Design a protein around this ligand. Structure first.
Ligand SMILES: Nc1nc(=O)n(CCOc2ccc(Br)cc2)cc1CNCC[C@H]1O[C@@H](n2cnc3c(N)ncnc32)[C@H](O)[C@@H]1O
Ligand SMILES: Nc1nc(=O)n(CCOc2ccc(Br)cc2)cc1CNCC[C@H]1O[C@@H](n2cnc3c(N)ncnc32)[C@H](O)[C@@H]1O
Ligand SMILES: Nc1ncnc2c1ncn2[C@@H]1O[C@H](CSCC[C@H](N)C(=O)O)[C@@H](O)[C@H]1O
Ligand SMILES: Nc1ncnc2c1ncn2[C@@H]1O[C@H](CSCC[C@H](N)C(=O)O)[C@@H](O)[C@H]1O
Lengths: 342, 341, 343, 343
């Protein structure tokens, strides 16, 4: 299938084992902002669901399918690849909705769906929006979408901003300097210090932070799910030019994302920005290998290049320079193995 | 085709050896001062067991235990490591000018060739509850390289079990499961999934420490002798009979382990008991879905059954009974999915 | 047949009036100084509503409220009491030299024959949650004896309800029911009865007091005007509510208290059982949800508290509450006759 | 029926409503001395149950019937008059025992059994053994017992002993002296002080105590449940002659009870004595109206007369005198309404 061709089997085994736990579904469901916003986006746009045919890509426990049912959908196809599909079926029966929701166990790239649908709903966002590569599954499902059907969410915006965090940068060396000693129980460890530094700097940091560390207005990269093809997500080239609002040392780039549900009645936004209540996506920070000094009014330009890999994630190549001075740095990070600092 | 790959799902082995490829994770184990200092003491204080000997280090990681064997006078040390950490170990061997004593051998101990038989095997193969990760079986397998009267460091392993009371922990886990009792979560009746949620949460062994006053009986001991055991020794049946010292609710069983290095100069013990300074193994508690009441003087009897699985862990079955009343508790746990409290 | 007997199971009534025959229970009410001092102040400070008037005391107990009416100058006081406490009231009337003014009439107010119409009725008919015991219906029934110009002391009653958070109370009740989850109690599997046990323990309203900081929204008020209400008005009591949540968290149930006002010609005097006021022997009352509701500050919590009178001198309570922003609902049935006295 | 003729309807309704609560069944089941001793008595005498026919009088949740099944019984008829019969039936089904336990809802005086039984099991003991009058239902059930059938429990012993407790005695007057004041909010309450004293003294005290308050060795009255008839329990006369071990003031008589399960293999005892761990029966104390001084070596002689009443309890009359001086005291008590003093 399309999925097997792009995914290492060992990655997929761990991935769907993770989503097979009720405790993991619960942690998503108890994200009030996440769950409440999906509900309002569906219910408040009821004319997008009443008497419609719906596809739910990666339905988990089924919660979003039940919302589409609350909004009056005539028939909902709920596709789920993990063993959570058996629990969703239990809930469809116990909620007396077997006439309106059919759970289809399997990957959306592999199952057979009988008819075209009016609207696709899904929650395919990962860290920095793109982690997990589920957005490609969501776009792949548009083979089942009628012309002039809709997508919920309709667009995804990933945001990037430069930050200063002296304590985060210095902490990498505090940890790595464990190895910089001549007699750890009699052993000189210091030949491994550089390798330890490199290992730490390749990890994106998942945690949150005070918005006062941000040094410029973010730059936005928009994916329009109604128009994009899954091939568009294999190599994501994000140019940036930041107009610095504050003077100081820039230690890296911070990432968050928004999605918008563009319905016939209204548009509803779900934001994971650090100005908004915290979600289970937190935010993501990638360090430069060396800080760059920038003055307020300088411009910080470069590119963030996301290169998809077969571990359902991306290699992150960042390059940046202060235009008015020529100072430049870079880094290359492995998004599959972030450091959870929160 | 090897013993390892026959008993191990590929996906599990990938994550396992990737985890141990991180320098940060070697640092974490190395900074366990009780663990690292105790291993050094067991080896240096039994220096006569290493002096001019041939050594095998099973799963050497950064190489730290091989360096201890070199300090103790070993003539040659084969340091076997299957993760990419083997490359970092070789860097340290060169930088410490021990290329004449420590020889790194990349690969699984079930698959590599050694030039000669060895006088003693060293390893740190203990996981949570002693047996997690199934590395003890690699340690035992390595005895194919051991001369007839060779030694093993560690030599024996003791698992300890004991009933405990802890209402707070019980209700902390019940409360999480109660989420799946709601008849109307955003309008959706979840309650049909409530038994499946209880089952899932209570299958998680709880890893953390606790005050010793929560133990309701003296612990029962189960001993594995690494000089004698075979790696097939896969299905572990631990019977127990506790003489209760206090009355109250028995919420589950607590587990810890000790290993002893039985050297020619002295026996050195590394203990993870709750009476001892904390280690990165902490302790493990397996909860009952429903607590049993017993009084002082009663006997609590049963069996802890550990079945090894292909994910490098164990399926745990605990059945316990208050002999005086016939009150019985039967519980299942997945040592692969612990809850780190 | 009497109106009382037609609405009351004999077994309930026998136990009810036996309870009130004990001097120790009269002492308990009398030693509630907020209650007794507030009644005395309502009567004496509105003495012109009693001077040279004819008074009916409904359910007089030991007679204390009739003595207050006599202190305020009432010409004649008919003190009606159905328990055996009536005989002790007669003793106090004689020993306080008030035989010319206080006339004990033993029996139910629905069944006695009163000698004449009265200017004012006094009573203490409030139970837990105001409505327990159904004695408000006897109070209203007694208006058959009230002159057109007449007054009622108390004159109105306000019931207050508000959402609360209290995980400890919830866990306490849930832990008791968990006994019936056991798969092997002395070798017996009890767990088929777990749902029945939860239902039973959560049917009990909790009578005790609490810190006002557990309250998550301003209370909603429901008023009964004793001058205007008819007996039959209290057979079905429907209290709608819409709360504006002031705090985020779990709503474990609704809290209840009540105030009564004595609206006299000189002043209005209030007796409050609110948790902001000194404790009384009515305490406060909390009805738990089997399933707590999560709400955010600014959300609305809406629904209905419905009280249906029953033949055991109490009410079957149904509470349905819903968080409007999410459609999360909780439905609960409670048996007001049999509370859990937690204090 | 025999039951309805001896029981006021109102008492019966309240009584079986009480036992219809799972929480009350849980209270009894959690009494570990009670429940464990019954289980030991049945299981350790397994030859009295193996392949036998059993009747469980007042089975409640069914717990004792499950113990009989554990001991090998072929058939158990489990009779229960409260709505708890519905819950027991649920447990019989969920424990896969419908082929061996037959729940029969109703009063044992009124249901029909399809055959005679080898052994009757029951827990009919109330406060100081006799409260609730359920021993009569247990004895009534012998109409279903085969000749040389057995009873578990087989005998019951009530123990009586004189006690000294100055603080318990004085406490009655502290409470009653609430009424001895001339102006409680303007009212002279004093005329009711005597009636308040009398009311307190009529209540047996349920709580526990230190065994050193006991002034003489106990006297024992035995009911043999194999031989006794219902009528024997309507008038229970217990004479006593205490030989005083300590000098001091005797303030009343203390009561407790033991039962014995006299099986083919061994006899097992369940004791509620103050020398044994506490049960939910505690102990019971009946004050004298006036204390009696006795010296060590004196004799305290008298009678405790228990008269059954139609509220499922007893009127207690106690008369006692110190033989060497003639000093005499008495008291009349209502066992139905004890004072629960325990904390
Ligand atoms: N809601 C969330 N909560 C979170 O915590 N995160 C962060 C998780 O970050 C991780 C990082 C590394 C690893 Br490794 C694992 C997680 C992300 C989301 C959004 N994702 C919704 C997932 C549902 O979609 C299903 N699903 C996926 N692909 C499918 C397909 N092709 N066909 C069919 N069903 C498919 C999958 O089984 C699950 O039910
Ligand atoms: N003041 C209070 N303080 C409290 O704490 N509570 C808590 C109640 O707790 C209870 C516990 C168990 C049971 Br069961 C019942 C209640 C309640 C009240 C209000 N109750 C005053 C009743 C007086 O009025 C009499 N009475 C009633 N109906 C009559 C009629 N129809 N005709 C004539 N006399 C009638 C009744 O005999 C008694 O003297
Ligand atoms: N079958 C096997 N063959 C070779 N190495 C193995 C193995 N199974 C596990 N290992 C390795 O054994 C190590 C266990 S951690 C112990 C590290 C080191 N000996 C120290 O004390 O610091 C890991 O590095 C893991 O990669
Ligand atoms: N005449 C009668 N007929 C049937 N049941 C009766 C009865 N009189 C009392 N009972 C019942 O007897 C029980 C006594 S309590 C004992 C309950 C249970 N056998 C146990 O040991 O735990 C109550 O449940 C009560 O409802």
């Amino acid at each position: 299938s399309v999925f097997s061709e792009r995914t290492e089997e060992s990655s997929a085994v761990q991935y769907f084992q993770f989503y097979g736990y009720l405790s993991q579904q619960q942690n998503m469901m108890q994200d009030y902002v996440r769950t409440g916003t999906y509900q309002r986006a569906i219910l408040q746009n009821h004319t997008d669901f009443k008497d419609k045919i719906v596809l739910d890509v990666g339905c988990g426990s089924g919660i979003l399918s039940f919302f589409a049912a609350q909004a009056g959908a005539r028939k909902i196809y709920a596709v789920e690849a993990s063993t959570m599909a058996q629990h969703a079926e239990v809930l469809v029966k116990s909620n007396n909705l077997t006439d309106r929701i059919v759970v289809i166990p399997g990957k959306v790239e592999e199952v057979s769906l009988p008819e075209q649908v009016d609207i696709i709903i899904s929650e395919p966002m990962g860290y920095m929006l793109f982690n997990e590569r589920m957005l490609e599954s969501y776009l792949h499902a548009k083979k089942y979408l009628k012309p002039s059907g809709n997508m919920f969410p309709t667009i995804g915006d990933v945001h990037l901003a430069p930050f200063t965090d002296e304590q985060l940068y210095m902490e990498q060396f505090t940890k790595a300097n464990f190895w910089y000693q001549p007699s750890f129980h009699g052993v000189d460890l210091s030949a491994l210090r550089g390798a330890a530094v490199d290992e730490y700097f390749r990890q994106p940091v998942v945690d949150t932070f005070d918005i006062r560390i941000l040094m410029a207005k973010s730059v936005k990269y928009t994916v329009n799910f109604l128009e994009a093809k899954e091939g568009d997500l294999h190599r994501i080239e994000i140019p940036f030019k930041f107009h610095m609002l504050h003077s100081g040392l820039v230690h890296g780039l911070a990432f968050w994302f928004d999605v918008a549900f563009i319905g016939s009645i209204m548009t509803v936004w779900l934001s994971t920005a650090p100005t908004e209540p915290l979600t289970h996506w937190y935010q993501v920070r990638c360090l430069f290998q060396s800080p760059l000094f920038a003055k307020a009014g300088d411009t910080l330009s470069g590119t963030c290049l996301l290169i998809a890999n077969k571990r359902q994630s991306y290699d992150i190549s960042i390059v940046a320079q202060v235009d008015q001075t020529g100072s430049k740095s870079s880094n290359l990070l492995d998004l599959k193995n972030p450091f959870f600092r929160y």
